[PDB]
Design a protein around this ligand. Structure first.
Ligand SMILES: [Mg+2]
Ligand SMILES: [Mg+2]
Ligand SMILES: [Mg+2]
Ligand SMILES: [Mg+2]
Ligand SMILES: [Mg+2]
Ligand SMILES: [Mg+2]
Ligand SMILES: [Mg+2]
Length: 112
RNA sequence: AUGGCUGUCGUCAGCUCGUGUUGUGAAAUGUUGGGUUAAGUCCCGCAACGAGCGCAACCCUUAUCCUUUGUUGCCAGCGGU
């Protein structure tokens, strides 16, 4: 059910057509999500993340946009995870070898 | 045919690479954009992240002062010359 009750989408003239099945749509020419559809999907996502947690992996929050920057760099980092809060450097994962060097430099300066 | 050495554009600020990404491909990005500088100088932004040769600095000389030493260099204070 509406365990949330705070999700209403963007204007209608900016909608991606392949989001049709998830759109309820109505007032003020602004799309509104179908919460009755999100809840099963959100629950399944949480279940899958929990299984990943059981395997003890990394989940790497990504919240670069200037609306949840602190919301990502908060107790969201409390338990076993990592996060990207500001600009996502291009290739942070595709070439981890080169970014690895910057991390080593950062660690050296922290101890320095 | 060449080594070595030299002039020149020009002491101009440019020239490149690894990995990543884009393109079927030649290639592109980075190196572009907003400011700024003598400078690809620096900051911010950014599918780029780093690095190298260049710029700058390290070199010599000149402009001020201090310590040291005082002859063949010097003469402010003392003696008569
Ligand atoms: Mg390709
Ligand atoms: Mg160039
Ligand atoms: Mg280019
Ligand atoms: Mg510029
Ligand atoms: Mg430079
Ligand atoms: Mg740039
Ligand atoms: Mg006399």
């Amino acid at each position: 059910m509406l365990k949330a009750g705070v999700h209403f989408g963007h204007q209608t003239r900016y909608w991606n057509p392949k989001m049709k099945p998830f759109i309820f749509g109505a007032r003020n020419k602004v799309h509104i999500i179908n919460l009755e559809k999100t809840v099963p999907m959100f629950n399944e996502a949480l279940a899958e993340l929990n299984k990943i947690a059981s395997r003890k992996g990394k989940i790497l929050f990504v919240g670069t946009k200037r609306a949840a920057s602190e919301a990502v760099k908060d107790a969201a980092l409390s338990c076993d995870q990592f996060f990207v809060n500001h600009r996502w450097l291009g290739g942070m994962l595709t070439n981890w070898k080169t970014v690895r060097q910057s991390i080593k430099r950062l660690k050296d300066l922290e101890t320095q």
